[PDB]
Ligand binder design. Structure first.
Ligand SMILES: *[C@@H]1O[C@H](CO)[C@@H](O[C@@H]2O[C@H](CO)[C@@H](O[C@@H]3O[C@H](CO[C@H]4O[C@H](CO)[C@@H](O)[C@H](O)[C@@H]4O)[C@@H](O)[C@H](O[C@H]4O[C@H](CO)[C@@H](O)[C@H](O)[C@@H]4O)[C@@H]3O)[C@H](O)[C@H]2NC(C)=O)[C@H](O)[C@H]1NC(C)=O
Ligand SMILES: *[C@@H]1O[C@H](CO)[C@@H](O)[C@H](O)[C@H]1NC(C)=O
Lengths: 49, 49
């Protein structure tokens, strides 16, 4: 569910927070993280999201 | 082969091989260009194995 604070667990990475949508398309990567290893960004290949 | 890599928002470019002694030098300083000056270097010890 989108744009709401919730408990999540994605690919073995989990926490509590608000998922959000951006538009910055990138031709490489399904996921991304902070340099601190905090998994901020991730991609959706099927939808392009 | 070892070389430096640039990533530009999931776009790579400006790649130079590290298959040369002085290039391996520039590779050691990970700088596309270096200022003149004094730098301490190792002896070439890659003659025979
Ligand atoms: C990245 O994010 C995208 C976007 O969410 C994910 O892809 C979507 O996945 C969801 C399900 O997880 C899909 O949602 C459904 O899509 C229907 C239309 O899309 C097709 O897919 C369904 C099966 O889901 C087919 O049966 C259908 O014929 C379509 O051809 C919507 O119509 C759905 O709503 C319907 O179903 C729900 C229950 O599921 C009902 O409650 C509704 O009332 C309605 O009847 C539903 O929304 C979505 O289609 C997917 N989109 C794409 C583009 O694939 C990715 O999986 C995710 N990850 C990656 C890596 O991309
Ligand atoms: C969403 O799309 C708009 C329309 O071009 C754009 O201005 C905005 O930057 C996009 N959001 C992103 C890239 O996070």
């Amino acid at each position: 569910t989108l744009d709401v604070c919730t408990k999540y667990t994605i690919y073995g990475f989990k926490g509590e927070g608000i998922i959000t949508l951006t538009n910055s398309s990138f031709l490489a990567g399904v996921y991304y993280t902070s340099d601190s290893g905090q998994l901020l960004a991730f991609k959706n290949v099927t939808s392009g999201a | 082969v070892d070389a430096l890599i640039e990533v530009q928002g999931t776009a790579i470019q400006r790649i130079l091989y590290c298959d040369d002694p002085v290039s391996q030098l520039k590779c050691s300083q990970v700088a596309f260009d270096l200022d003149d000056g004094f730098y301490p270097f190792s002896s070439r010890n890659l003659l025979s194995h």
